[PDB]
Amino acid sequence: GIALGMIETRGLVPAIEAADAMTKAAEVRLVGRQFVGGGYVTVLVRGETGAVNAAVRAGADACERVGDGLVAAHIIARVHSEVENILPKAPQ
Amino acid sequence: GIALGMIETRGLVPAIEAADAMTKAAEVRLVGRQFVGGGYVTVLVRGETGAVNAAVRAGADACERVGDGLVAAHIIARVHSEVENILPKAPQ
Amino acid sequence: GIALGMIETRGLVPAIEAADAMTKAAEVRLVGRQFVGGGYVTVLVRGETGAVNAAVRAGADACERVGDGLVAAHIIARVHSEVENILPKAPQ
Amino acid sequence: GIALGMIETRGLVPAIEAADAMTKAAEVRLVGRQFVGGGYVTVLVRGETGAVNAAVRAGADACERVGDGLVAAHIIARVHSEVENILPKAPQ
Amino acid sequence: GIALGMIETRGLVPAIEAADAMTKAAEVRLVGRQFVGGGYVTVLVRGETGAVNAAVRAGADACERVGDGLVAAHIIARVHSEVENILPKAPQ
Amino acid sequence: GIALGMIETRGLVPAIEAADAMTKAAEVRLVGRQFVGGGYVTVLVRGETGAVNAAVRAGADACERVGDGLVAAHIIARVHSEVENILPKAPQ
């Protein structure tokens, strides 16, 4: 499944809550957590479209009330193949 | 094609949306995504002039409403050869 | 014990106080301290659920009055196995 | 030619426009682009005094209207030899 | 002596003044200087409890009036052994 | 000569002007330029006490009017030997 779900937070703690809520909500794989600069943190998941819709919704609801909270919650159901080149495949 | 299109966003999520909209809009290659500091993120595309005009317009429209949104959308149709030395050739 | 406790602070000094108060409060292991960007710092502990509840409560109370203070104090008693992939195992 | 021209911007996009306008305006070499922190970006050029005067003027005019815009535009016609030790020789 | 003294500043210049005043004030060892992000800088000293009390007091008084000044001044007389794992042993 | 002169600026451009004015003003050696985070930049010089007094005064006057300007200008005529461990010896 190649849909992409992304949540961006202010700080790491809400990003970890978002990642947990996303991965518990539907069958998605956590492919990255990126320290963006300035305090933004982004967590990325992949899966089938329906799973990513459910996951991103659950992660937004969950992280909104944690720490400095939620910046963005967004889905792209099929990114262009060019965009794959900037997406992490595995987290570290 | 050596035209250059660039979009800068506040945060990574709108930058990924910009990259997707740009690369779907016209025949352009995504050459980099740069974490600038402070939370700015910049995505860079190359292509023929007409393709880059279409791409940057589509990416600006798309990322404006995502997360903390859009900072800059700019085209340079032929950068000086000196400028090539600071442009990424391939993303990571 | 796989419960997760996290405290995020503005600056390193309150994060070190949080880590000390957490690890003195109950049997938890300090698994990471992450410089997030922008001045956020996050400290992470693992342990049994009861121990992590006590630890995070003690760390929040303690670091609130140090430096620029407390951003987030949060517990996840059982993270999804996917989330383990973004959690540090050992600090540096 | 050892004169030094420097432009600092808020974000990368105006810095790339400054670099293009500088290098098109007169015979100068782009020696660096530095991500400073906080979102500042600095672009550095070397050349003969007259060329650097023209270049920095053209780059300031050009980048002022791009993205978050212009912070500094400055020339040093002959830096002390000590200062050479902190100036990049080649960009990456 | 295992007491810990810490001062956090806005910028490096007040941190260097804090480190000098701390190390002149009592027998303490400067174990680290950490660039935290966002402009915070933290300097860490170790020593016997009395020495660290004197040092941190002297460093706070001294750096308060330098640059963007003082964020935090804090002592932990005996950190938990877990906390040793995030404390630098030697500066770089 | 082991006196230490330091100037901290908002952005790199005023730091380079400070370094030039300092090194032209008296016999001092530029030992570092540090990107601190958040946009702070610090430049460090060493020399005899009189030379460092003259240099730091000249650098403060010069960089105040460049870009986002001056944060701190400070001299320590003899740092504690402990502080040498956090001072750069050579710039990069």
Task: Please say whether the beta carbons of D52 and D3 come within 8 A.
Answer: yes
- Structural domain tally of chain C? 1
A38: left (phi over 0), alpha (psi -120 to 50) or beta: left
Q: What is the CA radius of gyration of chain A?
A: 12
What's the rounded Cα separation, in Å, for the pair E21 and E19? 6
* Phi-psi region at E63: left, alpha or beta (left = phi > 0; alpha = psi -120 to 50): alpha
Count how many Cα atoms sit within 13 Å of the Cα of residue A84 in the half-sphere of its side chain.
6
Examine residue F91 and state whether it is found in any structural domain, yes or no.
no
- Cβ neighbours of E64 (radius 10 Å): 15
What's the CA gap between B20 and A78, in Å, rounded?
9
Q: In this structure, is residue F92 part of a structural domain?
A: no
Instruction: Show which subunits contact F, needing at least 3 CB pairs below 8 angstroms.
Output: D, E
**What is the C-alpha to C-alpha distance for residues B51 and B40, in angstroms, rounded to an integer?**
25
Query: Are F22 and F45 contacting, i.e. CB atoms less than 8 angstroms apart?
Result: yes
Q: Tokens representing E64?
A: 């308060």
Task: In whole angstroms, give the CA distance from residue D81 to residue C55.
Answer: 56
CA angle B28, B32, B34 (to 5 degrees): 140
The experimental method, as deposited, was X-ray
> Which amino acid type is present at position B17?
E
Alpha carbons D30 and B19: distance in angstroms, whole number:
27
Q: What are phi and psi of F28, to 5 degrees?
A: -130, 155
Q: Are E39 and E10 spatial neighbours (Cβ–Cβ below 8 Å)? A: yes
Q: What's chain E look like in SS3?
A: CCEEEEEEEECHHHHHHHHHHHHHHCCEEEEEEEEEECCEEEEEEEECHHHHHHHHHHHHHHHCCCCCCEEEEEEECCCCHHHHCCCCCCCC
Domain containing F23: what range?
A: 1-85
What letter represents residue A51's amino acid? A
Question: Can you give the C-alpha Rg of chain C in angstroms?
Answer: 12
Q: Measured between alpha carbons, how far is C70 from C68 in angstroms, rounded to an integer?
A: 7
Separation between Cα atoms, residue C40 and residue A15, nearest integer Å: 13
Cross-strand pairs, A5: A45, A75
Residue D9: its H or E element = strand D3-10
Residues in chain E preceding a C-to-N separation beyond 2.5 angstroms (breaks): none
| Tokens coding D71 | 């912070």
Amino acid identity for residue E66 in this structure = V
How far is Cα C79 from Cα C70, in angstroms, rounded to an integer?
23
φ, ψ for residue A90, nearest 5 deg: -140, 145
Neighbours of chain B (3+ CB pairs under 8 A): A, D
If you measure CA to CA, which chain A residue comes closest to C88? Answer: A92
- Residue A50 CA to residue A55 CA, distance in Å, equals 9
Whether residue B91 lies inside any domain: the answer is no
E33 within a domain of the structure (yes/no): yes
Contact D53, D78 (CB under 8 A): no
Report CB contact under 8 Å: C41, E37.
Answer: yes
Rg of the Cα atoms in chain D:
12
Listed in sequence order, the residues at least 6 apart from C73 whose beta carbon sits closer than 8 Å to its beta carbon are: C6, C7, C8, C56, C57, C59, C60
- For chain B, give percent helix, strand, coil, nearest 5: 35, 35, 30
Torsion angles phi and psi, residue E43, rounded to 5: -115, 135
D37 φ/ψ sector (left φ>0, alpha ψ -120 to 50, else beta)? left
Q: What are the two backbone dihedrals, phi and then psi, of residue D23, each rounded to the nearest 5 degrees?
A: -75, -25
Of D6, D39, D71, the CB nearest to F16: D6
From D81's Cα to the closest Cα of chain B, the distance in A is 25
Pick D76's closest partner by Cβ from F20, F36, F41. Answer: F20
3-class DSSP state of F37: strand
**CA pair distance D52, F78, nearest whole angstrom:** 40
Residue D10 maps to a domain: yes
User: Residue F19 region, left (φ>0) first, then alpha (ψ -120 to 50), else beta?
Assistant: alpha
Taking every pair of C-alpha atoms in chain C, what is the biggest distance, in angstroms? 35
Question: Which among E9, E86, B47 has a CA at the least distance from the CA of C18?
Answer: E86
Q: Which of D6, D40, D83 sits opposite F39 (nearest CB)?
A: D40
The residue count of chain F comes to 92
Beta carbons of B75 and B16 less than 8 angstroms apart: no
Handedness of CA B38, E36, E56, C23 (dihedral sign): positive
Residue E91 lies in a domain: no
> How many other CB atoms are there within 10 angstroms of residue A37's CB atom?
24
Integer Rg of chain F from CA: 12
> Two tokens at F50?
């009189």
Task: List the CATH number of the domain containing E80.
Answer: 3.30.70.1710
Q: Is residue D91 part of a domain?
A: no
DSSP string spanning B35-57? EEETTEEEEEEEE-HHHHHHHHH
Q: What is the 3-state secondary structure (H, E, C) of F38-59?
A: CCEEEEEEEECHHHHHHHHHHH
CA atoms of C39 and C67, how far apart (whole Å): 12
Option in E17, E33, E90 nearest F74 (CB): E17
Residue A60: inside a domain: yes
* Beta strand extents in A1-92 (DSSP E only): 3-10, 28-37, 40-47, 70-76
Q: How far is CA D22 from each of CA B38, B76, B78, F68, rounded to the nearest angstrom?
A: 25, 13, 14, 21
Tokens representing residue F27 in the block: 């016999």
CA of C82 vs chain E CAs: smallest distance (Å) = 25
- Distance from the C1 Cα atom to the nearest Cα atom in chain A, whole angstroms: 17
Report the C-alpha gap between A17 and A92 in whole angstroms: 17
List chain D residues with CB under 8 Å of F29.
82
User: Cα-atom radius of gyration of chain E, to the nearest Å?
Assistant: 12
Cβ separation of F71 and E11 shorter than 8 Å? Answer: yes
DSSP category for residue B89 = S
CA distance F8 to D81: 21
Buried b / exposed e over D58-91, threshold 16 CB at 10 Å, is bbbebbeebbbebbbbbbbeebbebbebbbeeeb
By residue count, chain A amounts to 92
Residue E23: phi, psi to the nearest 5?
A: -75, -25
Asked whether the beta carbons of C25 and E53 are under 8 A apart, the reply is no
Other CB atoms closer than 10 Å to residue C28's CB: what's the count? 28
Partners for E (CB, 8 Å, 3+ pairs)?
C, F
Distances (CA, A) of C51 to D36, E17, E85: 42, 40, 20
